[PDB]
Amino acid sequence: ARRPARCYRYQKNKPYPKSRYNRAVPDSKIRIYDLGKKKATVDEFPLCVHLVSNELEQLSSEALEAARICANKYMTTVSGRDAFHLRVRVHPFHVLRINKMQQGMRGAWGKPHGLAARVDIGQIIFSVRTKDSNKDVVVEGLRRARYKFPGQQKIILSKKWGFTNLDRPEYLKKREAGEVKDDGAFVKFLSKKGSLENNIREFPEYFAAQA
Amino acid sequence: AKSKNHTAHNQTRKAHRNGIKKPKTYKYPSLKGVDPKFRRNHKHALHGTAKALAAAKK
């Protein structure tokens, strides 16, 4: 009863969220977006590889969920479940309608059918962090997930240090200085702005210079 | 038996044949709806100054 994905590939509609105006919309088929060793510290996994869209289209909750499994299944069984951090960068917030069927074309407003993510050119879909000594496994995993999606996506080796917004050197520079400090699975950076007093609290290991 | 419901198609073609007539403007417009207390007085004021030109032609 799922219509072929062909029927909702394109963005022909303004976004139709779940809302007080909508209300009875089916649960999203994808529901975990963070797999693998997601507790992992930022220094642990420096290499970042992305799965990136090349089309303005729509991806189903279903195709994200399938793709998710595929990439994650490959990744762990080849290189272990704590070798990587998989992140789905895309949430399926757009409801699709269906005119299920006495009447005819009269009064044809549809009912919620399923969910989709609306996605740009260059929009990042999957993101992965690991150790460089794993690129190919990770890459191969994103390659296998590709087959689960409509339209062309292309995998891209990042310049950034894991899920961070800093290039590897600039991150190294901020770190082997004092400016960086660990947090959940991300990180916090000393600012030159704000109270001096409780800027020294946090980041004690700064406020020197040398070694 | 359904039909076209509504359209502006061709309406500004029509408005522009004879033109969108600019508003036309007069010196001495009407006092239509101007404060009646003012007007009542303004009336006697004018009576007065008129008198004083008939007077200045004695």
Binding site: - | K24, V34, D35
Partner: protein, 159 residues
């Protein structure tokens, strides 16, 4: 069915400006209007009484009547292929003196000056406005400023 009441579609129009709610400052009330003045029209949502219809929002007209709490503004609205005169009864909160006239009024006084000012010397004036002219010639030096050569740049990803 459809809905077309007086203040329809006006949700954001009559809204109040970020962090500018509440009393209206007294200067609004201290300003003075005279028949013949030009005013711009814009509704204060907090003043429901004597309020312009949404059509007249952002419209500029001439004052024709001065009353205890209000002014009468005539606006020419175009309906069909023609204008009709419209007279609005606006409260002073929904009106302000227009500047659409200052660059003229200030230019008139100015004109009168350099007119008499010049004349007294021995004429040669030119006081019509003129459009941006094109640029005249000019020589640009290189001293401390040899031209930097740029090329286009290769394609790259950073992401």
């Amino acid at each position: 069915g459809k809905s077309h009441g007086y203040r329809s579609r006006t949700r954001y129009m009559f809204q109040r400006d970020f962090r500018k709610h509440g009393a209206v400052h007294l200067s609004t009330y201290l300003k003075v209007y005279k028949v013949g003045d030009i005013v711009d029209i814009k509704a204060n949502g907090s003043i429901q009484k004597g309020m312009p219809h949404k059509f007249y929002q952002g419209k500029t007209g001439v004052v024709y009547n001065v009353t205890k709490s209000s002014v009468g503004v005539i606006i020419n609205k175009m309906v069909g292929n023609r204008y009709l005169e419209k007279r609005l009864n606006l409260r002073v909160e929904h009106i302000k003196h227009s500047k659409c006239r200052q660059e003229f009024l200030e230019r008139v006084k100015a004109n009168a000056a350099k007119r008499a000012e010049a004349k007294a010397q021995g004429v040669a004036v030119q006081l019509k406005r003129q459009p941006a002219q094109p640029r005249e010639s000019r020589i640009v030096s290189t001293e401390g400023n040899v031209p930097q050569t740029l090329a286009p740049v290769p394609y790259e990803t950073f992401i």
